[PDB]
Amino acid sequence: EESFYGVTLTAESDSVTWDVDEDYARGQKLVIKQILLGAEAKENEFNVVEVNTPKDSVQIPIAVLKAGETRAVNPDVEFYESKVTFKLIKGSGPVYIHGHNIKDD
Amino acid sequence: ESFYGVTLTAESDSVTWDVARGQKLVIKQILLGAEAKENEFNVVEVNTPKDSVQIPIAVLKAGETRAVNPDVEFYESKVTFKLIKGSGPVYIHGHNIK
Amino acid sequence: ESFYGVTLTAESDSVTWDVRGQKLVIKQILLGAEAKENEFNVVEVNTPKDSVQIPIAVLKAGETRAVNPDVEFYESKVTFKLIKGSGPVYIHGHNIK
Amino acid sequence: ESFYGVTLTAESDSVTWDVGQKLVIKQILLGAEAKENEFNVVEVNTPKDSVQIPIAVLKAGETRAVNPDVEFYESKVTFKLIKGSGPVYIHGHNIK
Amino acid sequence: ESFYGVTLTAESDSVTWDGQKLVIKQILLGAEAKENEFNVVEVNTPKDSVQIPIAVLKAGETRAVNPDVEFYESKVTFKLIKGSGPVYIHGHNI
Ligand SMILES: [Mg+2]
Numbered sequence A: 001e002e003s004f005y006g007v008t009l010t011a012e013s014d015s016v017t018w019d020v021d022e023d024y025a026r027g028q029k030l031v032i033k034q035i036l037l038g039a040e041a042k043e044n045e046f047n048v049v050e051v052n053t054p055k056d057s058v059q060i061p062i063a064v065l066k067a068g069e070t071r072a073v074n075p076d077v078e079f080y081e082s083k084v085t086f087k088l089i090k091g092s093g094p095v096y097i098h099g100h101n102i103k104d105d
Numbered sequence B: 001e002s003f004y005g006v007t008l009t010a011e012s013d014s015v016t017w018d019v020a021r022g023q024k025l026v027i028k029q030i031l032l033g034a035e036a037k038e039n040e041f042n043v044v045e046v047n048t049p050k051d052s053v054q055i056p057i058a059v060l061k062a063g064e065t066r067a068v069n070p071d072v073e074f075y076e077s078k079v080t081f082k083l084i085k086g087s088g089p090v091y092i093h094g095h096n097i098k
Numbered sequence C: 001e002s003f004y005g006v007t008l009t010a011e012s013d014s015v016t017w018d019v020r021g022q023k024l025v026i027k028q029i030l031l032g033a034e035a036k037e038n039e040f041n042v043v044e045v046n047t048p049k050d051s052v053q054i055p056i057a058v059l060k061a062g063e064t065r066a067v068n069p070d071v072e073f074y075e076s077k078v079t080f081k082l083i084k085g086s087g088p089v090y091i092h093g094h095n096i097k
Numbered sequence D: 001e002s003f004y005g006v007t008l009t010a011e012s013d014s015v016t017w018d019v020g021q022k023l024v025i026k027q028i029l030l031g032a033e034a035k036e037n038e039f040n041v042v043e044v045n046t047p048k049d050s051v052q053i054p055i056a057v058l059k060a061g062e063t064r065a066v067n068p069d070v071e072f073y074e075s076k077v078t079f080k081l082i083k084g085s086g087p088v089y090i091h092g093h094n095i096k
Numbered sequence E: 001e002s003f004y005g006v007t008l009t010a011e012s013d014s015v016t017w018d019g020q021k022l023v024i025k026q027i028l029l030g031a032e033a034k035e036n037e038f039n040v041v042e043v044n045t046p047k048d049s050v051q052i053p054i055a056v057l058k059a060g061e062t063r064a065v066n067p068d069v070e071f072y073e074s075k076v077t078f079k080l081i082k083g084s085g086p087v088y089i090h091g092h093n094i
């Protein structure tokens, strides 16, 4: 009951929302395993991804990357039955978000 | 269960988690903010009375260590996280699961 | 049930997995010691399931030696391609049913 | 279960874990006060499985932390700071 | 059921593990490892016909890797094909 999750964020397309079948609580969970900075990212430019979840008054950066210092982070965080939006609030990317898209429990 | 995300700064250096049965807080990542002062050590200390422990779980510094992934858990416990060194910001990520 | 270990290089820049309940877990992507200093090595994962195509590893001698995607692919073929760099790059994981 | 957090320093270089009990070591972290460029090595000793070996090699300026994610189902386990003055922090948990 | 911890060096550049399974959690470079020297650990598992580096370490760049790979019912041999180490391999057998 899983599917690979892989989305890309850029200055031009800075947001991605996960909301698998809006309102229906069947145990769906999104697990974010890795957030990776693209090879083309300008050296020394901070790239920050912020995660947003209304369900928990949540708004906080989950990744701070910079070519030359931090190429990737492995949050291994999860979001359960909730609408989650990832936004590139700093930098032009690209930034890739990888994880597990769990359909139910 | 629910995502856990709190921010610590010089202006607000402490947060507490106090729920109960079967509840556990898993701390997956502690990340240093982009604005953090270069070469400034930022230390997050966890305090858990129940398990008689007060110890740093993150030592970060722009230019050396941007993040740590403790992957530690606090089962059926009240827990306080404090930024005891540095001005931050520092982000603590995890989730609660019963 | 079986260890998965494949090598990608400029000469052999692509590998495909066709294995049903069969699943492929990718645990680590590692840059070889002979990889050129300062050369970006990018591995792209591709799968017909959900039309997937995205880099899953960006490596570079002197900056990033390895990544741990810890991602999985279920009942579907998966192709890994070294779209940038000459490697060698190693992909590690396992196949389980 | 219970959280496991212990500190090792030159002045207090060893800690022993005693009592299906399993000790899982998740992270070994180098303290901010650790001398720059100083190697700090934590050795583990688990007789039940016959193994004395370093499980962490840290150094300010190079490696701030390691995530062993190793477990000892075994009885008693001793961690010792065999190199360096620390402080070094060991985090994990005891699971019944 | 048991902690696995072995050391590889130029002098002792081989280790053999011969329901049984071996999970490799961490491969760590020793403090005495020569600065800037590449240390490569190759795993060889006959059952799946794989011989491939599982760790590439170097003092000053990469102190450790966390493969988190597993080997199901099979003989496994780890060889330090490059470098003098010491290199430590940690995990557990089930
Ligand atoms: Mg924008």
Ligand SMILES: [Mg+2]
Binding pocket: B010, B013, B083, B084, B085, B086
């Ligand atoms: Mg303070």
